[PDB]
Symmetry: D2
C-alpha cells in the first residue's frame, strides 16, 4: 500500500464552484435494515439533511436518485439477476420512495435508474452540464455500490466529485471504508460534511 504514494496516488482534488449536490438512493428500502440493509446507512441519511438544507440555502443545483424498475419487470436486467430484490423497486412501491427527511423540493431533479450509477442511462450528466456544475458533493447509499459507481461516473463525465464520508453509508462497514479508500486514492475529494460546507 506504499505504492499509492510512490506512484503518485491520492492527489488533492481542488474544489471549484458552481456546486451541486447528488444524493444517491437514500430510499425507504435502503434506510430500513429489514429490506436492503443498515450498517451506517441510517446515520448517513440524517447527517445528509444538513448538507441538503445547506444546498438549498446556497442556491445549489440538487439531484436525487431512485432505483426504479417497471411494474411488469420490463426493464429487468443483469443487475436485477445478481441482486434479485432490486426488481421490487417499482415506481409506486413505498420501498423505492425517497425518505421523508430528504424529500425533494422546488427545481431539484429526481433521476430514475435501473443501474448502480446515477449517470449511466440517465440524463444526470447533461442536467449538471446545462447548469454548469463544476464540483458535486455526493451522498447516499450504498457506499460500495451505487455511490461509488455514481462517483466514478461523475469523475469521468467531467465533474469534481466531493464524497461526504459522513453522508454515505453501507450495510457493511468493511466494504464502506475500502470503497472510501479507493475513491480517496483515485476518484475525488473525500472529507466529512462540516469540512465540505466550510
Amino acid at each position: 500500500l506504499g505504492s499509492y504514494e510512490r506512484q503518485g496516488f491520492g492527489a488533492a482534488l481542488p474544489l471549484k464552484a458552481p456546486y451541486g449536490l447528488l444524493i444517491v438512493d437514500f430510499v425507504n428500502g435502503f434506510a430500513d435494515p429489514a429490506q436492503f440493509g443498515g450498517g451506517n446507512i441510517a446515520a448517513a441519511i440524517e447527517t445528509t439533511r444538513t448538507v441538503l438544507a445547506a444546498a438549498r440555502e446556497r442556491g445549489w443545483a440538487v439531484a436525487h436518485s431512485r432505483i426504479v424498475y417497471a411494474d411488469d419487470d420490463a426493464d429487468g436486467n443483469i443487475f436485477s439477476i445478481k441482486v434479485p430484490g432490486m426488481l421490487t423497486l417499482k415506481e409506486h412501491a413505498p420501498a423505492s420512495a425517497i425518505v421523508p427527511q430528504l424529500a425533494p423540493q422546488a427545481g431539484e431533479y429526481v433521476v430514475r435508474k435501473s443501474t448502480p450509477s446515477a449517470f449511466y442511462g440517465t440524463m444526470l450528466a447533461a442536467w449538471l452540464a446545462q447548469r454548469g456544475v463544476q464540483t458535486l458533493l455526493v451522498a447516499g447509499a450504498t457506499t460500495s455500490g451505487c455511490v461509488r459507481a455514481s462517483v466514478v461516473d461523475a469523475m469521468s463525465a467531467g465533474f469534481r466529485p466531493l464524497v461526504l464520508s459522513d453522508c454515505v453509508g453501507d450495510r457493511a462497514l468493511g466494504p464502506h471504508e475500502a470503497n472510501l479508500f479507493d475513491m480517496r486514492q483515485k476518484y475525488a475529494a473525500v472529507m466529512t460534511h462540516d469540512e465540505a460546507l466550510a
Copy 2:
C-alpha cells in the same frame, strides 16, 4: 445481511462470449510506474485465456489508457492520478504488453477514464456482435477493472470476472473489489473454471 437481503445470486453464463482485457499495458506491467502487487501474474494467466478465445472465435477487445500529447484531454481522473497524463499515444507505457499483443480484428479501445465503456464504442462494438457474456481480465482490480465490470453489467452484458486474470498494486484493494463484484456485478471465477464452462 448480504445473504439475508438476497445478494450473491449466481449469474448464469450465456453464449456468445467475448473477452475484454483492460489496461494490460507496460505502464501497469511495470512496478516503477504503475504496476506491482499481483499484476504480473494476472498478465501471464491472461495469455492462456486470450489463446482460448482466439481458438474459439470470440470477440476480443483490449483497453488502453491514452491521453493527448499536449494534455488536450487532461481530466479529473488526471488530477487525482497525475501520472495517467504520462500515457501518451506512442509512450511505450501505453502500449499493450507484447505477450498479449493484439491480433486480427480484435478491438483496441482507447480510454481516458477508468472504464472501458466510458466515452468509447465498446457497447456498440459488442452489441453489434450480440455478445451476451463478457469475460474480463486486466488491471487495476480496484480501478479500471471494477469500473469496466460495473459498466458492462449496466449496458446489458453479463460480466465474467476472471479472478486470477485481474491484478492490482495492493492485495487489500484487490480482495475488497472482487468481493463487491461477486456480490453485485459479476460471476467471479478462475480462468480454469470459466474457460471450461464456457
Copy 3:
C-alpha cells in the same frame, strides 16, 4: 451520393426488435404537435406491432416526458416551448390507444429527441441480442431520425418503416427518409419489411 458509395444496402438480420417512437396523444392530434401524415403512420404501425407480438420480437415504445415542476427543462424545451407540456400524467404525453403497450414491452421515457439519449434502450436491446431494429414513430425529421442514427451508432441495423414514420410537413419527412436511406438505414415499407423478416 452514388459516386462516393452512399446508400449501400443494409442487409436484414435477426433477432428482430421494434421501436415505436413518440406515438403519443400530443403528437397524433394536429392542434398540439401532430399533423400531416402522422395519423396514417399510427394506423399502419398497428399491423407491424401485432406481427411483432406474434413473432416474439422485443418491442420498445418511447415517450417524451419532463418533470412536473420543469426541473429537467433543458435546451430542447427552449427551441420547442411546448415539449415541457409533456408531463408524466399529462394525456398529451400518453401513448396512443391504437398502440398501447402490453406485458413485456419497454416504455422508454426521454426529454430529448433520441430514444437512446440518456436512456437504457441500447442496454435493453443488447441484453436480448437484437441485431436489427425496426422503427416507427413521429416525427420523421425529429425523434425518429435522431433515434435511427443512434441505434445505428449503438451497433443496431436500423430498418425504417417509411410508411410507419410520419411528420408535420412532407418535405422534411421526405428529405429525412433520403438521408436515412443514404447514410443510416434500410428504409422500406412495412409490408416488405414484414416479409423479409
Copy 4:
C-alpha cells in the same frame, strides 16, 4: 409547413457564455470531391478559419472531430456497412487528417469517432462539461450528416447549439438546406459567422 410557428417550433435560443467551438470532420477526405467532399464544403472550410481564429484569441474551448477506423477494420460498424468508404479513414491516411487550413494547436481537443456525431462514443461531452461550456458554436461537414448528428447531441448533452450557417458544408445543397431548417427549428440558433461573433 405553417405548423411549425403554430405549434411553437423555431423559438430563439439565446447565446450564453462561456463559449466553445466544435469543428466537425473538416478532413482532407471531405474537402476533396473525389472522396467525400463537394458542394459548399470548400467555402465552409475557408469561412471557418475566421471563427477558429476568433475562438483562439477569445479563449474559447476548441474541439475538432475526425472520423477514424482501425487499420484492420476491426471496428467496422453499421455506419460503414451503409457508407463503406468510411472504412478508409484510417488514423494515418491523408484522407483522415484535419485540413491544413484548420490545423489544430494548443489544448485544442481532437476527437476520433466512427459514428456521425462527435458526441457518440467519445469524451466530447465530458470535455465541455469540465470547461463549463454553455453555448457551443458548430461548424463542419456534412450538414445533413455528422453536423446534424453532432448538433442534436450537443443539445441533448445540455449545451446550447449554434450552427454556423456559412461554416457547415455539404455535397448537395438540397440536404444542406433541409437540415438547416430542422436545426433552426428544434435544435439550434442558426446564423452566419459575422452575426455570430459580433
